[PDB]
């Protein structure tokens, strides 16, 4: 289909095609320098410059270097510098620039690439979609929302924009309003709408409102490969890790840790209690919108495997005791933290991001009654000085109906079946 040859590029179709062939047959190095020759002899040719860029890209794949890709990106901008660039070639060159700026993790820039793409092509709805995405990658949810509002303003049965509008509404606690957009987006079956996030959050929205075929949705997502199961709904997974809601210390082999937690638990408690009496600001409320009602706060010592030095000021002996167990301190997919929950609190059913971690709870201050946690179908109890364990990748729910506070200590560990390679490599969460 696409027309990537302007007037002057047609008079050199042969040369460009010769060099394209070299690239297309795998000889990258050959093609790279042929397109360089084209570009010096034809320094305004948009096709030759796209040629240079495309083969820089293939060579970043060749070498798996991100140097290379860094370079192909300025060359993709180069192509748009030039005169009389066919619009097709223009769109392609800048889209690729944005896509590889995301593959490398440069979102602020991808954002400006995509803003410029939307300026240049104000009737393409897909660009406005891909721009709403670029806004979500940086966490700029307001502007994404507007972008999807425009899009829907003018093509209301666009399912991509529906699901993303829904995801945005949900993340803002507009649970009801988000349900119809999520549902319509998914069933639209458009490109971009078959995505685990939308299933996950549509189901959660229903459970919250009291609608019963949330589970509908969860099992279909199971059907289409997003969820390992209907109950285990994490999304940043390593397939085939043993999955079970509840483990025992033995089942994890982390027994030295469990022991060091149970034997030393009063130290841990007492340091938390101090932080609650003299340094209560170190405890920060839960900001992930997981509560129906109530008061819940968390005092975090390790996140993503990095120790919080100011935080360990208030629990030094605890942080010192944990240093000797890298199976949690270097769980870049978990945390170590005090968690206080007060009476009147209900945590919606929910699921963590990842099956890569197991979650350990050491009872510090646990009332006689009121305090319980379901995971899957089994409901359990904390105990002062003892450790519970579960896969928070499974659905789980919590209540706190006692008459005083409930303090636990959360320690996340790598899943036991995960290599030292997987442990050093997996991107942090």
């Amino acid at each position: 289909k696409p027309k990537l040859l302007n007037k002057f590029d047609k008079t050199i179709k042969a040369e460009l095609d010769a060099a394209e062939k070299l690239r297309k047959r795998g000889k990258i190095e050959e093609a790279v320098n042929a397109f360089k020759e084209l570009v010096r002899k034809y320094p305004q040719s948009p096709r030759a410059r796209y040629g240079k860029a495309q083969c820089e890209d293939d060579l970043a794949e060749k070498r798996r270097s991100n140097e290379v890709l860094r370079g192909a990106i300025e060359t993709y901008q180069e192509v748009a510098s030039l005169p009389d660039v066919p619009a097709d070639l223009l769109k392609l060159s800048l889209k690729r620039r944005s896509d590889r700026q995301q593959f490398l993790g440069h979102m602020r820039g991808s954002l400006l690439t995509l803003q410029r793409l939307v300026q240049l092509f104000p009737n393409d709805t897909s660009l406005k979609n891909d721009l709403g995405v670029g806004y979500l990658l940086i966490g700029d949810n307001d502007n994404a929302k507007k972008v999807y509002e425009e899009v829907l303003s003018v093509t209301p049965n666009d399912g991509f924009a529906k699901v993303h509008y829904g995801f945005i509404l949900k993340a803002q606690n507009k649970i009801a309003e988000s349900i119809p957009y999520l549902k319509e987006g998914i069933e639209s079956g458009d490109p971009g709408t078959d995505d685990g996030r939308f299933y996950f959050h549509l189901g959660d929205a229903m459970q919250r409102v009291g609608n019963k075929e949330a589970y509908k949705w969860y099992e279909l997502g199971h059907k289409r490969g997003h969820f390992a199961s209907v109950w285990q709904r994490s999304l940043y997974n390593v397939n085939g890790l043993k999955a079970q809601p509840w483990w025992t210390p033995k089942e994890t082999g982390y027994t030295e840790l469990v022991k060091s937690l149970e034997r030393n638990w009063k130290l841990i408690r007492d340091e938390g209690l101090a932080v609650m009496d003299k340094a209560k600001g170190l405890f920060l409320p839960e900001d992930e919108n997981l509560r129906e009602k109530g008061d819940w706060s968390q005092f975090t010592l390790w996140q993503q495997g990095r120790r919080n030095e100011n935080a360990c000021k208030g629990a030094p002996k605890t942080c010192t005791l944990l240093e000797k167990f890298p199976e949690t301190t270097g769980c870049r997919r978990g945390q170590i933290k005090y968690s206080i929950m007060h009476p009147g609190t209900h945590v919606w059913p929910h699921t963590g991001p990842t099956n890569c971690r197991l979650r350990m709870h050491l009872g510090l201050v646990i009332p006689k009654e009121g305090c319980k946690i379901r995971c899957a179908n089994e409901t359990k109890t904390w105990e002062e000085g003892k450790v519970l364990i579960f896969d928070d990748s499974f659905e789980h729910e919590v209540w706190q109906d006692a008459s005083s506070f409930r303090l636990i200590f959360i320690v996340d560990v790598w899943h036991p079946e995960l290599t030292p390679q997987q442990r050093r490599s997996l991107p942090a969460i």
Binding site: A60, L137, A171, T354
Partner: peptide, 18 residues
């Protein structure tokens, strides 16, 4: 914004390269 106990953010990892 990070995914600590749930899955609220659009993307829970921050890509950086190969």
């Amino acid at each position: 914004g990070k995914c600590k106990d749930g899955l609220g953010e659009y993307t829970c990892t921050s890509l950086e390269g190969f």
